[PDB]
Write a protein that holds these residues in place. Structure first.
Motif, short mmCIF file in Angstrom:
data_model
loop_
_atom_site.label_atom_id
_atom_site.label_comp_id
_atom_site.label_asym_id
_atom_site.label_seq_id
_atom_site.Cartn_x
_atom_site.Cartn_y
_atom_site.Cartn_z
N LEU A 1 78.63 33.05 101.71
CA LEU A 1 77.70 32.73 102.78
C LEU A 1 77.98 31.34 103.35
O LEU A 1 78.11 31.18 104.56
N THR A 2 78.08 30.33 102.48
CA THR A 2 78.37 28.98 102.94
C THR A 2 79.72 28.91 103.64
O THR A 2 79.89 28.17 104.62
N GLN B 1 76.64 33.59 97.65
CA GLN B 1 76.25 32.39 98.38
C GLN B 1 77.45 31.51 98.71
O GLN B 1 77.44 30.83 99.74
N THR C 1 81.19 29.61 111.47
CA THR C 1 80.36 30.58 112.19
C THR C 1 81.04 31.06 113.46
O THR C 1 81.29 32.26 113.64
N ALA D 1 73.15 44.08 106.80
CA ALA D 1 72.63 42.90 107.49
C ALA D 1 71.39 43.31 108.28
O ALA D 1 71.44 43.54 109.49
N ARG E 1 79.12 30.01 106.92
CA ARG E 1 78.24 29.05 107.58
C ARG E 1 78.98 27.82 108.06
O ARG E 1 78.51 27.14 108.98
N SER F 1 63.98 37.36 107.27
CA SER F 1 63.59 35.97 107.05
C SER F 1 64.68 35.18 106.33
O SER F 1 64.39 34.21 105.63
N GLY F 2 65.94 35.57 106.51
CA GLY F 2 67.06 34.81 106.01
C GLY F 2 67.11 34.59 104.51
O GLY F 2 67.32 33.47 104.05
N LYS F 3 66.92 35.65 103.73
CA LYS F 3 67.04 35.58 102.28
C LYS F 3 68.10 36.57 101.81
O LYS F 3 68.49 37.50 102.52
N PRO G 1 67.92 42.37 110.00
CA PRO G 1 67.20 41.19 110.50
C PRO G 1 65.94 40.95 109.68
O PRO G 1 65.25 41.89 109.30
#
Ligand SMILES: Nc1ncnc2c1ncn2[C@@H]1O[C@H](COP(=O)(O)OP(=O)(O)O)[C@@H](O)[C@H]1O
Lengths: 144, 197, 72, 72
Positions: C64-65, C61, C71, C39, C68, C43-45, C41
């Motif tokens: 990830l969702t 993904q 959280t 992880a 998300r 640009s969130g890709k 830091p």
């Protein structure tokens, strides 16, 4: 390129020029994979194919006009070209054998030094060819 | 005979920033690779040269990952992934050793290039880098140490988990070369840099 | 035989703080896919490594969702 | 093209033309090394072939209507 002709007259080698401006692809200077009919190598490889001797006088044209929109720079392959001992590590994609460009004397040309790819900014000697005066132009006209 | 076959000892190896004298494995006798990296301000594009296999690209990406995790421990640029390109040159194409040929070597080389601090000579380092900064044990350390002794280098740092291999090799090789045990790339960061930071 | 070529009976494996162990299947028998996630830091890709297809990307993904929506 | 015809008539040599526009590769000018039936040289060799004289007046038609993406 007249300076190139004069140099090749001094060394009595074979002279050649290849355009490098407007190049946007690494595959334009490197080769292509054997993935279609008549896969083509890079411009330098075919220019060498034009010549018959492995120690000619070769000239580049606007090396400062490189371009690449994906990761990696053309200056990396040209830096491999720079060192004659590293010339034996030539990048290639159609052929896979790195050519021996050590004896191929490289002379370069870039109308703008500040747009030369900065990985190629090391080991440059800017021989700034100046402008010409009215009398100088008159003389070179009356002579050449 | 004339010219010496190889460059003089400790003459081809000088304390420089972009250089990286990393041990390598070859089938017909181990050698040492002088890895060269070019890091001066750019935009973040990666570059590889030398007919390399792609695995070195992921090793370099892992090195950049580790640097992005502990950037401020040594004064590396705060936001460098979008401001500096990396151009790595390897003297050979790839090694038959599966995985990265030397991951910690490339990681420390790129860290030195970004920090512009010369890398220490008289030390040859090899090992595979991990994204979590863990130096996974490497196989075939025998020829690595043999070439390192042939390289004139007595200080060879090795992955910590390879410590057991320090009891299977003959004592003729182990005693003649100094060895340190490391598991974090941050540990060898201070052991392959001229300054402490 | 020398030193144990392979890790002992797994009561203490290698230090795992950012990576997780994983079972899988191969033509050469089952393995342990210790998936390593970093992880950094940025640009969130998503930047996958290990020559993975887009199916691996959509699994990632989906994870990830899921985080998300969970959280806090 | 009619100007070219007039020029060739003044020079009294047989005019010709070849629609070099719409050619999308280097292969249509150099051909390819003969290795099968249907091995065909470039357009210029065709033009010189159908004009049975060694000094024609060839008109390179639409020379600014080419593309370069593949095959040289
Ligand atoms: N002092 C001079 N400076 C520049 N060009 C000169 C001079 N004297 C003569 N010339 C002529 O100018 C010409 C420049 O042509 P060329 O070499 O094609 O230019 P470039 O290499 O810059 O494209 C040469 O053919 C040369 O004969």
């Amino acid at each position: 390129t007249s300076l190139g002709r004069s140099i090749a007259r001094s060394m009595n080698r074979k002279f050649h020029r290849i355009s490098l401006g407007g190049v946007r692809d690494e595959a334009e200077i490197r080769g292509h994979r054997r993935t279609y009919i008549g896969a083509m190598p890079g411009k330098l490889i075919h220019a060498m194919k034009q010549v018959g001797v492995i120690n000619p006088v070769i000239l580049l044209d606007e090396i400062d006009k490189m371009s690449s929109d994906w990761r990696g720079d053309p200056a990396s392959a040209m830096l491999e070209v720079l060192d004659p001992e590293q010339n034996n590590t030539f990048t290639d994609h159609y052929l896979d054998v790195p050519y021996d460009l050590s004896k191929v004397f490289f002379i370069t040309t870039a109308n703008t030094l500040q747009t030369i790819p900065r990985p190629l900014l090391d080991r440059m000697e800017v021989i700034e060819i100046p402008g010409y005066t009215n009398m100088e132009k008159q003389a070179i006209a009356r002579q050449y | 005979l004339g010219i010496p076959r190889y460059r003089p000892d400790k003459a081809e190896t000088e304390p420089q920033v972009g250089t990286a004298q990393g041990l390598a494995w070859t089938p017909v006798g181990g050698t040492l690779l002088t890895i060269e990296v070019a890091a001066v301000p750019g935009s973040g594009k990666l570059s590889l040269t030398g007919q390399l296999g792609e695995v070195m690209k992921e090793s370099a990406q892992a090195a950049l990952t580790y640097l992005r995790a502990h950037t401020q421990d040594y004064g590396l640029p705060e936001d460098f992934y979008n401001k500096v390109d990396l151009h790595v040159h390897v003297p050979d194409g790839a090694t038959p050793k599966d995985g990265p040929s030397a991951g910690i070597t490339m990681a420390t080389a790129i860290a030195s290039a970004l920090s512009r601090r010369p890398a220490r000579m008289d030390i040859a380092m090899t090992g595979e880098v991990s994204l979590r900064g863990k130096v996974m044990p490497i196989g075939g350390v025998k020829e690595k140490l043999l070439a390192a002794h042939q390289a004139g280098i007595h200080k060879i740092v090795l992955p910590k988990d390879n410590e057991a291999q320090l009891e299977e090799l003959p004592k003729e090789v182990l005693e003649g070369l100094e060895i340190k045990l490391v598991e974090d790339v941050g540990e060898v960061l201070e052991y392959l840099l001229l300054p402490e930071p």
